[PDB]
Design an enzyme around this catalytic site. Structure first.
Site, PDB file in Angstrom:
ATOM      1  N   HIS A   1       0.810  -1.216   0.000  1.00  0.00           N
ATOM      2  CA  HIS A   1       0.000   0.000   0.000  1.00  0.00           C
ATOM      3  C   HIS A   1       0.843   1.265   0.000  1.00  0.00           C
ATOM      4  CE1 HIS A   1       0.200  -0.026   4.520  1.00  0.00           C
ATOM      5  NE2 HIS A   1       0.138   1.281   4.332  1.00  0.00           N
TER       6      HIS A   1
ATOM      7  N   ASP B   1       0.216  -7.691   1.669  1.00  0.00           N
ATOM      8  CA  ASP B   1       0.617  -6.282   1.684  1.00  0.00           C
ATOM      9  C   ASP B   1       2.131  -6.199   1.868  1.00  0.00           C
ATOM     10  OD1 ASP B   1       0.599  -3.569   1.689  1.00  0.00           O
ATOM     11  OD2 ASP B   1      -0.242  -3.358   3.703  1.00  0.00           O
TER      12      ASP B   1
ATOM     13  N   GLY C   1       1.557   6.880   8.824  1.00  0.00           N
ATOM     14  CA  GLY C   1       2.923   7.235   8.535  1.00  0.00           C
ATOM     15  C   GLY C   1       3.933   6.209   8.992  1.00  0.00           C
TER      16      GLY C   1
ATOM     17  N   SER D   1       3.281   3.094   8.234  1.00  0.00           N
ATOM     18  CA  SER D   1       3.035   2.120   7.175  1.00  0.00           C
ATOM     19  C   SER D   1       4.335   1.674   6.542  1.00  0.00           C
ATOM     20  CB  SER D   1       2.235   2.804   6.057  1.00  0.00           C
ATOM     21  OG  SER D   1       0.860   2.872   6.333  1.00  0.00           O
ATOM     22  N   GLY D   2       4.452   0.363   6.333  1.00  0.00           N
ATOM     23  CA  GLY D   2       5.581  -0.191   5.635  1.00  0.00           C
ATOM     24  C   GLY D   2       6.783  -0.482   6.506  1.00  0.00           C
TER      25      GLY D   2
HETATM   26  C1  LIG Z   1      -5.223   6.777  11.547  1.00  0.00           C
HETATM   27  O1  LIG Z   1      -5.292   5.356  11.477  1.00  0.00           O
HETATM   28  C2  LIG Z   1      -4.462   4.724  10.578  1.00  0.00           C
HETATM   29  C3  LIG Z   1      -4.536   5.111   9.228  1.00  0.00           C
HETATM   30  C4  LIG Z   1      -3.748   4.518   8.274  1.00  0.00           C
HETATM   31  C5  LIG Z   1      -2.879   3.514   8.688  1.00  0.00           C
HETATM   32  N1  LIG Z   1      -1.986   2.762   7.970  1.00  0.00           N
HETATM   33  C6  LIG Z   1      -1.347   1.900   8.819  1.00  0.00           C
HETATM   34  C7  LIG Z   1      -1.808   2.061  10.093  1.00  0.00           C
HETATM   35  C8  LIG Z   1      -1.365   1.319  11.315  1.00  0.00           C
HETATM   36  C9  LIG Z   1      -2.408   1.184  12.414  1.00  0.00           C
HETATM   37  N2  LIG Z   1      -1.889   0.294  13.468  1.00  0.00           N
HETATM   38  C10 LIG Z   1      -2.798   3.104  10.030  1.00  0.00           C
HETATM   39  C11 LIG Z   1      -3.618   3.718  10.989  1.00  0.00           C
END
Ligand SMILES: COc1ccc2[nH]cc(CCN)c2c1
Ligand SMILES: [Ca+2]
Length: 223
Positions: free
Chosen positions: A40, A84, A175, A177-178
């Site tokens: 993603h 993912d 943020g 992510s990844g």
């Molecule tokens: C605000 O919520 C979000 C929104 C996008 C997101 N991407 C990855 C995550 C990790 C959550 N553990 C996440 C959380």
């Protein structure tokens, strides 16, 4: 990272920042020329930033290297987030040292109860937004498959695991992510998704890296 601590500069030497004019995702250096991140996170024009602590200040240990190729997993489903995972090849090999280093891939899957380290530059608040400039860390256990499935009915596949705290208050967030989930010195997870951040009964969900080791190794060997 919500509810974590400041890691300390270059104490997580495999952590990378993916930059497209700004930080947008984390990743993990797995050898001198390859980074693993979440599918993603995919986009074109990625610069990989190694050796970072403060992502807004040049502190002296950084290496900035453009990506030459990105490979999203062939079965990635953006609706369910199954599979993912993505690989990024660097245009040139990183120079490895004590502050920029690769993380080993696992030879076996980690069991529930194993303590892991999650890190990233994501939002630090469960309500509202505050993005840190320095890298944040969180120690969290892998949760049992049954608690994970009970928290997210119908949504957890065999390629995902939950880690964190059912009471809330500590989690990865937007943020992050990844980024890496490292347990016993091996990369076991990738920050993938969740319902909000740090909410009760809604732990973070992570890509289960041990299911992908053969794909990673065969892909790197041929690209
Ligand atoms: C605000 O919520 C979000 C929104 C996008 C997101 N991407 C990855 C995550 C990790 C959550 N553990 C996440 C959380
Ligand atoms: Ca910096």
């Amino acid at each position: 990272i919500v509810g974590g601590y400041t890691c300390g500069a270059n104490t997580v030497p495999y952590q990378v920042s993916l930059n497209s004019g700004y930080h947008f995702c984390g990743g993990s250096l797995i050898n001198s020329q390859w980074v693993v991140s979440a599918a993603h996170c995919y986009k074109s024009g990625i610069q990989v930033r190694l050796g970072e602590d403060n992502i807004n200040v040049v502190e002296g240990n950084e290496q900035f290297i453009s990506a030459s190729k990105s490979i999203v997993h062939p079965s990635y489903n953006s609706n369910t987030l199954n599979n993912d995972i993505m690989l990024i090849k660097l245009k040139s090999a990183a120079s490895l040292n004590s502050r920029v280093a690769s993380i080993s891939l696992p030879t076996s899957c980690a069991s529930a109860g194993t303590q892991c380290l999650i890190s990233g530059w994501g939002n630090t608040k469960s309500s509202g937004t505050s993005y840190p400039d320095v890298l944040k860390c969180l120690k969290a256990p892998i949760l049992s498959d049954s608690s994970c499935k009970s928290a997210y009915p119908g949504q957890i596949t065999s390629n995902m695991f939950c880690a964190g705290y059912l009471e809330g208050g500590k989690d990865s967030c937007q943020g992050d992510s990844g980024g890496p989930v490292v347990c016993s010195g091996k990369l076991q997870g990738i920050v993938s998704w969740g319902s909000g951040c740090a909410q009760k009964n809604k732990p973070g969900v992570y890509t289960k890296v041990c299911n992908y080791v053969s794909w990673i190794k065969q892909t790197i060997a041929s690209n």
